[PDB]
Amino acid sequence: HHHHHHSSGLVPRGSGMKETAAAKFERQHMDSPDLGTDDDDKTGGGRADPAHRSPVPLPSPTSNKQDISEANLAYLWPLTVDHGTIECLPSDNAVFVAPDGTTYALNDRAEKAGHPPITPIRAKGSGGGYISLGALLSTTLNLCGKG
Template sequence: MASALTGLALLALTACGGNSRSDPDTKDPVPLPSPTATKQQISEKNLGYTWPLTVDHGTAECRKGDQAVITVPDGTTYALNDRARHAGYSDIDPVRVSGDSGDKVSLGSLLSKTLKLCRVGR
């Protein structure tokens, strides 16, 4: 089971593109504490070069049915995975940053951290 989950995580990371940024405000990320709820504050300070959004922070959350979402400072909640998109949450592209190569920065690290919230309390 663990190897299957690892494989899925790697697939998600590569499927989203491996592009990163060379200009984040945070070059030495601060680790997130272990999640204790299905909702957690997350920011560029936690992901550094792999922070994929134009805003510097948000609230990551796992909602019913493993729907991974992030709510940004203006109050908009965006889908981070297909389950959330199918549930009707907005596409993340309006706040997704482009990396040095011009491609969108991968959602892999943000999605991975958010999916960990789905396992809290199980």
Template sequence: MSEKNLGYAWPLTVDHGTAECRSGDQAVFTVPDGTTYALNDRARKAGYQSIEPVRASGDGGDKVSLGTLLSKSLKLCRAGG
């Protein structure tokens, strides 16, 4: 998945990576350097680190919503389910 896929809704400071669903309900995102981050609470509870280090800030300084990326990642959970 890349910035090109989500355009203005892209919430990360990296321009691409791999969204996955692991163990049925853990939404994760792997960035180009190979680090895998949690996109939801279940992934965080499973031990994946927070996505915050690569989360982008908007014009007002607030963090860009992960909603669209998380939604697309959770669809992978349902598809694989």
């Protein structure tokens, strides 16, 4: 399904914001069929090339919280757990939650609270000790609003 729009394409300016929010909006829906095939000569996608970049943009951020996964970070993902959710608690403590239901401390203060560090699920490399979680920490801190 390919459509052409007279209006110009996307620019670095971004979506931007309007002075006043629209009182009325139109509902939008997407078609996702659970049943599909690939062996068939026809392909589910169209002739058009998919997204040039593999990393998927971050999800729309709710206050002090975002969902993150290996898909977002691409090979950079250092954790063995395929995904996890990041949250800043009212206590100004940044922690990482894994699908397993275990909470790990991202920042120093959470560690002070006696929460275990992400290390048990952190990948070890051939050299240079373990793979840094610095990137994950930065994201959570942004949600915390520190600064």
